[PDB]
Design a protein around this ligand. Sequence first.
Ligand SMILES: O=c1ccn([C@@H]2O[C@H](COP(=O)(O)OP(=O)(O)O)[C@@H](O)[C@H]2O)c(=O)[nH]1
Ligand SMILES: O=c1ccn([C@@H]2O[C@H](COP(=O)(O)OP(=O)(O)O)[C@@H](O)[C@H]2O)c(=O)[nH]1
Lengths: 367, 367
Amino acid sequence: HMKVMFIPSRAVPFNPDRVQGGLEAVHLNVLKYLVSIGADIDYIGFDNDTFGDWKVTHHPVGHLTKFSLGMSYTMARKIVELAGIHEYDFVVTMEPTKLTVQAIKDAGLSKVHKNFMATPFEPVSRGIVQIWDQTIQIHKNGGKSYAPTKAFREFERKYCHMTSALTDKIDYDYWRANPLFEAEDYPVICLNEKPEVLPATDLIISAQRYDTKMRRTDVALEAIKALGENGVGYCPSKWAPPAKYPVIIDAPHSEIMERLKTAKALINTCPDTGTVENSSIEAISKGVPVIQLVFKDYPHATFEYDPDTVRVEIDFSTPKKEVVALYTKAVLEFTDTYEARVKRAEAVWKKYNRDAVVAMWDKIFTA
Amino acid sequence: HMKVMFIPSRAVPFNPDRVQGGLEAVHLNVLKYLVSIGADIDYIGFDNDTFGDWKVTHHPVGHLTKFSLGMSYTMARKIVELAGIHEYDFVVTMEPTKLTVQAIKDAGLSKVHKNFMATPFEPVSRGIVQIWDQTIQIHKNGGKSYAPTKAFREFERKYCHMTSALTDKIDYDYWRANPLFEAEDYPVICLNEKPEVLPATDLIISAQRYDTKMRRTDVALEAIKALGENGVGYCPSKWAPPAKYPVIIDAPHSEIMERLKTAKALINTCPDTGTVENSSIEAISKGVPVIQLVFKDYPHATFEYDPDTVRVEIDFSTPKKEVVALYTKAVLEFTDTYEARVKRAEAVWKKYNRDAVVAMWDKIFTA
Ligand SMILES: O=c1ccn([C@@H]2O[C@H](COP(=O)(O)OP(=O)(O)O)[C@@H](O)[C@H]2O)c(=O)[nH]1
Ligand SMILES: O=c1ccn([C@@H]2O[C@H](COP(=O)(O)OP(=O)(O)O)[C@@H](O)[C@H]2O)c(=O)[nH]1
């Protein structure tokens, strides 16, 4: 019934069986929903996309390895073409280029533009500055952007005061006076049936990319080593750790989730950029607590999913030597009741049950 | 030309190639009939339904994984909407919710309401109590409900007097004074070609789920062991027996049926809840007799399919040790003539031949 134009993320071709974090998770979740309600989707994507049995009218702009200029102009041209022959209820985007945003405007779709975000603002990165520059442009044009969490919305009010040598073009006057995200909640997960919380083993799991700068996974896997038999780490091969930390590489996501059901806790060591944190909600939805490394006075999505989360508190000056010891101490000394597992699973059930999720989507997809 | 509103079962999305029992079988068979007579069908279903080539005007209420409250209110809203624009000859229902039944009444369709049932009354189950509560409500509102067998209608006169802590809301006064089902069966089976009754081997077959509580399959497989070479058991993997009872797991249904053609008898050990009993009619339609374990003074579908069925008679207090011995004795001592095979096959052929099945449906779908 809904007619929708869909402009995807541009890092990798779409695959429904991919499970990772970042923008790809948002991309998948929005698309999956639209397919579930039988939307007529004009998907301006890449020749190497796959959709399985999903009904999608595909408009390829080229084979994707690295997104190119030619591809972008093909995409922009296609936007305008399609908008001429079809009446779209909405156009969906995933952190689009300047050219896409301009094309949406010229096509007359700016006021039905629904944009979704995941990448934190990082002034040092030319590419990310462009992303947020266009988030500002979308707001000026009268489109709407949506954040997965309240944490991300709080971070956005910090982002407007962050500058660098690369941010001279950014309209900070406009940004500071206009919160770029809409107030409405976004369904980061969808629970169709009320979860059956299983009792804990002693096993604690880290389901994180090996990334010392962003996620401080070295700290995580140092705690894993200290746990011995009661500790396991999962890493993708694309973000594998050094040999000194044995982990399970590229495990089927389903098997990780199945194992997580009976875990005592989840290790999460991303302190400063906890904007979405999918592995946290993956755990808490099953009743599993997160042992969260975090900066003092920083927002974090984990505390949103479970207010009672255990905090291992640091700041940017805390030496690695201390951080490891302090975090390892929290992990080895971790206790948690079965009732607390039921409680935290219930809170997430109350928020992200199917009926609540559809209501959330409805508010997003309103003209 | 005939205009019908169709409210489906709610456990799984509709698939025409699904070949399970229960309410889904009734759902499929009623829909298939309506399609066969070229009915104009407004189907208030789920986005993930599929219909193949069948002509159906689909009115989705959401993607179905677990039926939700939101879906139910969407469905109820759609009922009222459609009834405002269209004059329906019938509205078809599959064990509906309170909300659906109320919606049908408010829409002014209660007197053309045709409801179909399959689930036996179980006072301990909150969900099933709701189902039968609404069966009562349909009768009060002036709709009509239909049972698979005469046995099911006899069971309904026992259901009147069954209570629990969950049945305080049930209007037992009304129920006891009003048999809920109409006199016509809905056709549980359809025989397209007359079976040619083949002479018996000595082989006796149990085609039952391993379920000691409901079907007392342990008793069955104890008789199988006593038969030795002249005994075989079939079980699905979802209801497999212990190692002590060797059986054939997840055999193609067609192979079981093919084998059954030359069997001396069929073992059926469900004494209490013989409401439909598909394996009984599967056997008797091929001329194969059933050796039926049954409670004294209890109805049973087997005796409906073949009045002359041999009864192994027990009650609830009979110890398992005795029941096994008594049933094993009946199995080993079983004799049966070829003429009796022809006779029982003929009776079932007369009742459930394709043309008779159409006639059965026709009587149900009369104003
Ligand atoms: O070996 C692994 C480790 C993680 N994950 C999944 O990858 C996602 C990681 O996303 P998250 O938001 O937790 O972190 P990010 O990678 O975006 O920093 C989660 O769904 C994890 O369960 C996975 O599939 N395999
Ligand atoms: O290994 C097996 C055992 C049984 N059945 C079929 O499953 C049904 C079981 O009988 P029925 O539905 O009467 O019993 P219920 O399972 O409902 O108690 C019949 O159609 C059997 O032929 C089957 O396909 N495979």
